[PDB]
Amino acid sequence: IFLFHETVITGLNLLSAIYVLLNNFRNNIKGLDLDTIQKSIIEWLRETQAANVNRANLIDWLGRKHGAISEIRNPGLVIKEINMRLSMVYPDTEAAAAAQDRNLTTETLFAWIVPYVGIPAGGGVRPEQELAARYLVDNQRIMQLLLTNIFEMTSSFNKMVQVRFPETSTAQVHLDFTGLISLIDSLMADTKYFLDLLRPHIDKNIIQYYENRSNPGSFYWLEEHLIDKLIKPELGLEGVNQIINKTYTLLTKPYNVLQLRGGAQRRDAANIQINNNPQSSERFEQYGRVFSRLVFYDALENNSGLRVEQVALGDFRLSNLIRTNNAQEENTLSYWDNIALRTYANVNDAANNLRRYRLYGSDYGIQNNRSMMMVFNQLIASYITRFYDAPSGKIYLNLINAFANGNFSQAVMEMGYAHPDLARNNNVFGHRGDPTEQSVLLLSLGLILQRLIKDTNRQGLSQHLISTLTEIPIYLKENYRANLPLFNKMFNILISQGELLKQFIQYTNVQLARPNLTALLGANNDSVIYYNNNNVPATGLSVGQAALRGIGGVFRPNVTLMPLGDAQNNTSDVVRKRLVAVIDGIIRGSHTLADSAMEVLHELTDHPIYLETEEHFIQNYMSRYNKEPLMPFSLSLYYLHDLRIENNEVYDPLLYPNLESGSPEFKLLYGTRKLLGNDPVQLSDMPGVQLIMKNYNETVVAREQITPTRFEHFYTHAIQALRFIINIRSFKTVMMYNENTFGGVNLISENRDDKPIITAGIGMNAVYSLRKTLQDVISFVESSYQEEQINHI
């Protein structure tokens, strides 16, 4: 009964979770199927009357099936918005410098294609219909969602799902699923094996309840939907890969070009025509804005597309260190009062008017600004916050030494090598140029770390630093144990995202040009930050930009921020070098902090045993109750619970490294820390898994017993599946702009028509941890009365 729960039900829940993710992945990729979208648009133009040529009619069309051409789940997401200013996507193909380019929108294109509806006598596609298939599709949105979905899915660990680039004639991108497929076969075989073994001792009704194909989440239901209709054919996984490749190829292929000039008086007049003499850059869709947003920010949109409201510096716990010298000295952090005479605001107006752009926070995890740079800086913020003990006012030096005194000593000790996230009030974030490899750290966090390394008391001794581990409080070492692995894994997720983006940029022909930013925004060609007819030069000499009294500004030209520039400063080659530079900076910082986290962890006497709620919990439980606490592997599946949604994006507080020692969330993280990691898990690292095995073999006779190799194999496959699922939904997905993506879908439901893992309803087949609260799980472990918990199961 207990063993059945721990083997059959656990394996069925894990396989069902794998199916949910794979099926949602399939639906998303089908939703971004560019081959179908283009062919359907051409068919629409072939079969539509001239009067019905409008975006509404096409949206209705794509929502329907037309012969072999499949419907699209969400037509409006992949067709350009009606008023999308076309110069926002196609670089200067456009003349953004006029008030006539303003009347040039997708509406103009729909008005331009009216005369080229219908089929020529030959039956072949019109050239205009091929141009319409290109220019009417929101290609940038497709590329963004495709990249994000792939990046959520990519699972190089355990060689599960590997994104390989075979650069042949097609712009080839392949998702090798062999590892995940072999793992699915393995867990299905193990699930069937324990079913066969336990059939004689379990009620026939229970076995049929977990086997009958009509019951969702049963073994044979999975054998139908997960294997027969997904892994090995409905659209199979290899067909999904085909659509991924074809879509990416179609996104990056050469096309014929239109001359997008227009605007007689309104948006239904066309100076548009075929351009049979195009520049090379126009034959290719450009995705510089998309990649920019993925890395740091998309400067073209309001506030560079970020959520950056000016807040008092004291919103952050460590605001007293957003400073320039010791606490007892006179602060010099200020802002430019007048640029003509280069005067600084005085102490009072500086301390009262200075605001921080809220790109990170101390009280929450990653919940906004899911770009690589801002995720990176928010992780640093939480890092310093969690490990700086306020009552003592100390942080362990080895945590930050390599970062602030080593690889990133420039961003912390020198000025200009950080993004300026401080300014006087009534100065919005605005439209901001590209950072460099050396300005991916937020200036505010750099100043904090500078204060952490350098601050000294009146006797010259270090103010904030503890030099030896022996003097770290106990609970803080517990916090180390539980949170440092999360920090390492997350900085490595950033590294993996950056390296994979680099492989896409390098091993495919994608063009990464930006539009004519200065024309669209009306900014100066020397402007490094522009917002509402204010031009911030690369010197940073603008009223309100942060500065240091008596020394100068926080901007270093050609380092802090690049000019936003015109189309010529926004070519695919240029933006390519800029994106890769920012990526490399993120990667270097993440490597350094991750190595430091592991270094401090290695110095600690860390022997994680599965579901110890705290140090020495097992031995003390044995001492008090003379028995070994129940720690079934099933409880780890609690992490498969529904993620939290905020502003349509998932996050997971349970699996964010800001947890506090002794809390229930912390106890789960402390118990499952090696299980969440990437290291092999031996069966002695899970003592309750070994005890349930021994207790079942003591009852059954030789023929029906289990080998420590069959148990080791099942659980190796149980570990891998759980890690694959968790790494998708709670990490890769959470650390990226994930709206309209598959990674964060709920795996659980109380409706069996909704999900194959059914909790608290007709068809309920979920493990104990998915039907109960976290407190129930922790007490499941820490209760003396084991018989009543076994009675629960």
Numbering used by the authors: 2 to 93, 96 to 236, 249 to 808
Anything the authors wrote about it?
From the outside to the inside, the virion of ASFV has an outer membrane, a capsid of viral protein p72, an inner membrane, an inner capsid that is approximately 50 Å thick, and a nucleoid of the dsDNA genome and viral protein complex. Proteolytic cleavage of pp220 produces p5, p34, p14, p37, and p150, while proteolytic cleavage of pp62 produces p15, p35 and p8. Among these, p150, which contains residues 894 to 2476 of pp220, is the most abundant virion protein (in the percentage of the virion protein mass) after the major outer capsid protein p72 (15–17). The inner capsid is likely assembled from the proteolytic products of pp220, with p150 as the major inner capsid protein.
We then chose p150△NC (residues 267 to 1101) for structural studies. The elution volume of p150△NC from size exclusion chromatography (SEC) indicates that p150△NC is a monomer in solution. We obtained a crystal of p150△NC that diffracted to a resolution of 2.4 Å. The phase problem was solved by molecular replacement using a model generated by AlphaFold. The final atomic model of p150△NC contains residues 268 to 1074. The two molecules in the asymmetric unit have similar structures, with a root mean square deviation (RMSD) of 0.188 Å. The structure of p150△NC has an open-sheet shape resembling an upside-down triangle, of which the thickness is approximately 38 Å and each edge is approximately 90 Å long. The structure of p150△NC is rich in helices and consists of 5 long helices, 23 short helices, 16 310 helices, and a few short β strands. A DALI search for homologous structures shows that the structure of p150△NC shares no structural similarity to these of other proteins or the known viral capsid proteins, suggesting that the structure of p150△NC is likely a new fold for the assembly of viral capsids. The results showed that the hexamer of ASFV p150△NC could be fitted into quasi-6-fold positions of the map, with a mean CC value of 0.46 and a similar orientation to that of the Fp150△NC capsomere.
